[PDB]
Amino acid sequence: HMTMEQFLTSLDMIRSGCAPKFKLKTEDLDRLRVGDFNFPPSQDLMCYTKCVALMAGTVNKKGEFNAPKALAQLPHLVPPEMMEMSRKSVEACRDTHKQFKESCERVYQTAKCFSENADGQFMWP
């Protein structure tokens, strides 16, 4: 498992493996970091979210969200304090990806759904 302290630091480590692949605005990343997905994303920002989810092993390369695998991965992704919120959001957003065809959009829309269904503070790497 991870502690809250390890979680908050993991956010930066995850970002470091994905951000360099894209052209991104710091203010966009700042907003996603606090779960504010309330602004139009660029293609780059959407594909950044796919890179993050791919690292997490929660989507495939087609951006299809894998709910059972996400649930299995949660202890490697969030601290105990965030487990139930995350469980609830996986359940609410498991089918979000089926409304979209393009892989980066599929992941971005699912992440946005997580942020919107989060009954507490939501943080994206």
From Swiss-Prot:
Butan-1-ol binds at A53, T58. Keywords: Behavior, Disulfide bond, Olfaction, Pheromone response, Pheromone-binding, Secreted, Sensory transduction, Signal, Transport. GO terms for cellular component: extracellular region. Ethanol binds at A53, T58. Specifically expressed in chemosensory system in both males and females. Expressed in a subset of trichoid chemosensory sensilla located on the ventral-lateral surface of the third antennal segment. Secreted from non-neuronal support cells into the sensillum lymph that bathes the olfactory neurons within these sensilla. One of its GO terms (biological process) is sensory perception of smell. One of its GO terms (molecular function) is pheromone binding. 1-propanol binds at A53, T58. Disulfide bonds join C18-C51, C47-C104, C93-C113. It is found in: Secreted. Belongs to the PBP/GOBP family. Odorant-binding protein required for olfactory behavior and for activity of pheromone-sensitive neurons. Binds to alcohols and mediates avoidance behavior to high concentrations of alcohols, the alcohol-binding possibly resulting in activation of receptors on T2B neurons, the activation of these receptors inhibiting these neurons. Acts in concert with Snmp and lush to capture cVA molecules on the surface of Or67d expressing olfactory dendrites and facilitate their transfer to the odorant-receptor Orco complex. Required for cVA response, probably by binding to VA. This is General odorant-binding protein lush. It comes from Drosophila melanogaster. The chain holds residues 30 to 153 of 153 of the full protein.
